[PDB]
Amino acid sequence: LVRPKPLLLKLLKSVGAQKDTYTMKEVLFYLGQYIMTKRLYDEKQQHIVYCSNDLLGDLFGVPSFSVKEHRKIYTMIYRNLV
């Protein structure tokens, strides 16, 4: 379905993803694993994700975000897809 642009593809490959084309659900799976494994989420309010100085901040263009902002996260992702 979707083809990540190169920076997002690099993030997905760092957690094991090997393909060029993914479903959105698989992009989301790998991105959650990226966040989890790099400990980017706040340990007390775990919907807060810190990304400034990680590749993810560059991708999204924000220094932090909340997981609860669903429409914003979809939008940011799709700016990194073709």
Binding site: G32, I35, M36, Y41, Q46, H47, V67, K68, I73
Partner: peptide, 12 residues
């Protein structure tokens, strides 16, 4: 909720 529980909410 935990991170992955919020992320599930995002995915569903």
């Amino acid at each position: 909720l935990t991170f992955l529980e919020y992320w599930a909410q995002l995915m569903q």
